[PDB]
Design a protein around this ligand. Structure first.
Ligand SMILES: CC[C@H]1OC(=O)[C@H](C)[C@@H](O[C@@H]2C[C@@](C)(OC)[C@@H](O)[C@H](C)O2)[C@H](C)[C@@H](O[C@@H]2O[C@H](C)C[C@H](N(C)C)[C@H]2O)[C@@](C)(O)C[C@@H](C)C(=O)[C@H](C)[C@@H](O)[C@@]1(C)O
Lengths: 49, 51, 103
RNA sequence: UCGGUGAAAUCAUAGUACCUGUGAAGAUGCAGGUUACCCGCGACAGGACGGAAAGACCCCGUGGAGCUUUACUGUAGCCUG
RNA sequence: AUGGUAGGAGAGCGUUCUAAGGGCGUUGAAGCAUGAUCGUAAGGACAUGUGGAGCGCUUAGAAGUGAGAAUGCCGGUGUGA
RNA sequence: UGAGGGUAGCGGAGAAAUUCCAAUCGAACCUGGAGAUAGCUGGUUCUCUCCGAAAUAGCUUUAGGGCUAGCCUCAAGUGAU
RNA sequence: AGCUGUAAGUAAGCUUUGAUCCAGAGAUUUCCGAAUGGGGAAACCCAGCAUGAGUUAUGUCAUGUUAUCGAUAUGUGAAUACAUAGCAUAUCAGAAGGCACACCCGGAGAACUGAAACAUCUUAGUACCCGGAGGAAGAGAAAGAAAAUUCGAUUCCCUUAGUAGCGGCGAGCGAAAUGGGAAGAGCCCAAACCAACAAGCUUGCUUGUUGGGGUUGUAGGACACUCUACGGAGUUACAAAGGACGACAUUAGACGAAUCAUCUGGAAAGAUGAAUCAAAGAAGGUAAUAAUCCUGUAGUCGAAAAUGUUGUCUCUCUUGAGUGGAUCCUGAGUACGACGGAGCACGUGAAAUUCCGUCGGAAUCUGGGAGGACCAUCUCCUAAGGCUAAAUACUCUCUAGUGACCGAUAGUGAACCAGUACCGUGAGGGAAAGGUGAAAAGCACCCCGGAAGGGGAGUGAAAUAGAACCUGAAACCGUGUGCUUACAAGUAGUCAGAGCCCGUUAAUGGGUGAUGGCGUGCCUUUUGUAGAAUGAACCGGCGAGUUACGAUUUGAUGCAAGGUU
C-alpha cells in the first residue's frame, strides 16, 4: 500500500506516500553476486552480502 | 379429511367443482361455492381445529 | 392425419357432405387439395408456350381439419388411430379395423 | 406584364378607420362624435410600443468562472538540521 | 342559508384492468359519422349510416386514471403567395 | 509553398492579440459521476356542494426565502365564559 | 413421403435401396486477429530450412517447420585460469489474449453535493482506472467472546436498536454482546525424541538427507509410568471400492377417449335439438366463439451421451491406550515501544484493539497475551506456521414456465432493412419504418391514352378490400346547393325579432337572419393587465405528488389487563 495523508494544523488532508529506505548493495543472489536494491530493515538480519 | 387422490382425480375435470382438504380450507373457495359436501371425519377435524 | 391416395369427405366449406379423392397434401402448412373441391377461376395471360386463355377452373388447397377419412367397412366419417404390427405401424379407423391405402 | 417552376421569417381568433378623452398614466378593438360603396394592382414607409435575440447596460442570487494581493487555509518545491 | 382567489372539508362522473355473477353479439361487437334525446354537473342512452369481431351491465377491488397553454417532444397540414 | 513527422488541455504553441489548438477557447471535444444543485422562472390534466383568509408583530449572512405567533378549515370537548 | 435455406417458384433433378428432416459422434475447416518466420496502413507483402511434383536445369508450385519468455536434459566458455555466467542445441507446451469485470478480493482514488456560505465533517472508500482469480470468492477452528453456575470455528437471516456511542457534540454517522434460526466438520506442519544414510571429522561429535513421532493449557507432546486396532467402517478437506455399481430429468421420441343433424351464412366452432368422453373442460389453429375437426393436454410406454449418484458397495479404514507433568520442546529482527498515518460505529488521541513506513528492540511455563490509559488481585487464552465443505452473492447464458406487465409516439434504441440509413476527422451519437383477403382466386378481354392513370367486364361475401391495399378522426383542400350580403365602423357573440326555406329522438320544432339593445379573447404573473407585460400558427397524439421503508394522527375491525409475532 504505502499511501496515506499529510495533515495540517487545521487538519486539512493531502494524499502522500511513505517510501522505504532502499539502498543499493551487492548481495549473492542464486548464481553470481548481483548489485540490487534492498531495504535497510531487510538487511538488518534478513540477508547477507 | 387428509387426501384422496382418486376422488381428486375424479372431480378434477368437472367445471364448477373443487376439491380441498380440511386443513387446506380457505375462505375464497368456500364463498365461491354454492354448496359444501363433507365427510364426517373431515367435519370433526375442522370442528376440533376451529373450536 | 392422412396420405395422398385417399378417399375422403369434406366437413366444412361450401362443399360439405361431398366426397373426393386427395391428390396432394402440402404438410408444412397443412393444406391438402381434393378433386372437385374448392374450385378457383384464374385469369390466365399468354404464357411463353400457350395462348392468352380466358378463365381457368382448377382446384385449390383446403385445410386438413375440414377433411375426414371414411371407414371402409361402413363408409362413415371416422378419426384415425395407429396400430403396431411386427415393428411396422399402420392406420386404424377407431370404429373398425384397418384402412388400406397405397394409391 | 406573359408562359413554366415555386420557398421563408411570422401567425390567440378576426368583418382590423380617424379625432378628443378614458385607462397599467402613449388604444384598430373602451366612451362620445366625425368619416367611410364591395374587391384588386403598382408604389411609400408613420403606427401595429412591427419582426429578429427568455437585455450583454442596472440591481439581485449566502449562483459561477478568470486574474490579483501584506485576505483565510493549505501546498508542489527550496533551505537547514 | 347558499358571491368568492391561496386554501381546508365532503360527495360524485368517466377511463384501463382483475374477481364473481348475470348478459349482448355475422338476424352484425368495439370504433367512426349524424341527430331536434336524458340527467343539477362531470356525463349516459336510443335510432340510422359505415365497419366486419369482439363488448357491455351489477358489486367489490387495483391504478402508467381525465391536458389548452410548459419559447414543451413527435408527426401531419396551413399562412405569407 | 508541398510531402512526411513532432509538441495535447492542472496541457501545449504563441515576432504577445487572452492569440490558436477541426466554422467554439479567460481554459477544446466525447463519455461517465448525473435525474449534480437551482431559496429562481415556466408548467401541473374531470365535476358539483359547504366554509373561507393574508399581504402583519418578532428573530434570521435576514430582506422577492424561512420559523413560530396572528388570521382560515375539519373533528372532539368545555359548556355562558 | 415428400424434398431441393430465410425469399418464391422455373429449369434441372433426388427420393421407400428409407430421401428432406430430429438428436449423438467424427472428418474437413481459406485469410486476419493474442497472431507467434520477418514486416505491416488487420484480413496484405516479403522470405528461409527440409522433403515432394515438375523442369535439361533454374524458375514456379505443394506439404511440414521457423516468435518471445518458461520448464525438463547437455556441453560451452572474453576483459581474467577450472567454475558459472552468458552463449549454442534436443524435448514439452506452462503462460500470454478475450473475461459477462453482473458477483468476489486487492492497489489507487475524485468532485459536484449537504452543513441553507465554508475549511474539520459529508458526498464516499462512492464513481472511474488498474490487476487478479473463480464458479463462486472471502472468512474460518480461540494468545476469543464475556463476567453466568458461562459460551458453538466461520458465514448468512430476524431482533437487540436508530439503542449505546462518535460528532464545528453541528449536518449527520452509527455498533456489539445476548437471544431466536439456516447450515454444521476439525485436519495438518515446525520443534522436542528416536533409527538409518553421506561429508567433515575419526566416526565420538557436528552438519545435512530419509523415515517415524506430535503439534496443545483447570498444560499438550517427547522422554517416566499402561496395555491395544478394523469394532466402527465414509472419498465435501483430512485415505479409499476405479468396483454387479439397481429410473440423469427416465430427455430426443411414440401412443393417447369421445358428435351428429337442421337454421342463418360466403364459410360455422354460433342458435335450436338430440348424444358422448373425461386421471384429458390447459392452450392454440381450423372460412365466425369447438372438451368430442387438427396440433395437443392428462396419462402410459420409452434409447445414446446416460447412470438418480444412489443402496452390502473388492483393497483400505481408527477397536484410545490412563497418571504425573519433575526435566526438554512448543513458530525473533517477532511481540512490544517512539514518531508520522490509515482502518475499526470512534474526528489520531489516554487509543484500549488491529494494519503501513522510519528508527529501536524482549521474554521463554516460576513464562507470555487479553479483559477501552496505568498499577495490583481475579477470569479467559497460549501469537509471531498452513488447509478446510455447507448455509451466502450475481446472471452475458440455457431448459421449462408465470403476470389485476406493453400492445407499434407503448414496450428493448431496434416487432420491419439496427446499433442499420444518417451525422461526426475521431472517440462517439443514433433514427423513422407492422396489418389486402378465408383462399392470390392479385383484375383474362374491350375502350380512351405515348405511357401513367382510368371506364367497363370479370374474381370475391365485400374491390370507396386493388398492393400509396383492416378501420380511416380532425386540421387542411375542393364541387354543389337552401337562407343571406356591395351607405357600411365589426372580442363577431348574446337577448329581442320580421321575412324565407324545411319537417324531428314530435316538443310550447329545426335552418338562415332585414333590424334593435348589451358587449375590450384565454392562460400566467400581478396593488392593479383589453392591455402596447408572458405564452400559444392550426390539428392530433405523448406529456407532471408516485412507490418502498419508518413516524404521527384520524376512521374500520378483532381481542382486551392483556395484545402481537
Ligand atoms: C448582418 C447579419 C446580422 O446583422 C447584425 O448583427 C445587425 C447589424 C445588428 O445590429 C446592431 C448594430 C449595432 C450598432 O447596434 C445598433 C450594435 O449596437 C448591435 C449590437 O448590433 C442587430 C440589429 C442586433 O440587434 C440589436 O442588438 C442589440 C444588443 C439590441 C438592439 N435593441 C435596441 C433592440 C438590437 O436591435 C442583434 C444582436 O444583432 C441581432 C441578433 C439576432 C443577431 O445576432 C443576428 C442574427 C445577426 O446575426 C444578424 C442578422 O445576422
Amino acid at each position: 500500500a504505502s499511501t496515506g495523508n499529510r495533515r495540517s494544523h487545521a487538519l486539512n488532508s493531502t494524499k502522500r506516500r511513505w517510501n522505504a529506505n532502499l539502498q543499493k548493495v551487492r548481495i549473492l543472489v542464486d548464481g553470481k553476486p548481483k548489485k540490487v536494491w534492498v531495504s535497510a530493515r531487510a538487511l538488518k538480519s534478513g540477508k547477507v552480502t | 379429511e387428509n387426501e384422496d387422490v382418486n376422488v381428486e382425480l375424479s372431480a378434477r375435470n368437472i367445471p364448477g367443482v373443487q376439491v380441498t382438504t380440511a386443513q387446506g380450507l380457505n375462505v375464497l373457495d368456500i364463498t365461491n361455492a354454492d354448496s359444501l359436501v363433507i365427510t364426517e371425519a373431515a367435519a370433526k377435524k375442522v370442528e376440533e381445529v376451529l373450536g | 392425419h392422412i396420405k395422398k391416395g385417399d378417399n375422403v369427405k369434406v366437413i366444412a366449406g361450401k362443399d360439405k357432405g361431398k366426397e373426393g379423392k386427395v391428390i396432394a397434401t402440402l404438410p408444412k402448412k397443412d393444406r391438402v387439395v381434393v378433386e372437385g373441391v374448392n374450385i378457383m377461376k384464374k385469369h390466365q395471360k399468354p404464357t411463353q408456350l400457350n395462348p392468352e386463355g380466358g378463365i381457368l377452373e382448377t382446384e385449390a388447397a383446403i385445410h386438413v381439419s375440414n377433411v375426414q377419412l371414411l371407414d371402409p367397412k361402413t363408409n362413415e366419417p371416422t378419426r384415425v388411430g395407429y396400430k403396431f404390427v411386427d415393428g411396422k405401424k399402420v392406420r386404424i379407423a377407431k370404429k373398425s379395423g384397418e384402412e388400406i391405402k397405397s394409391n
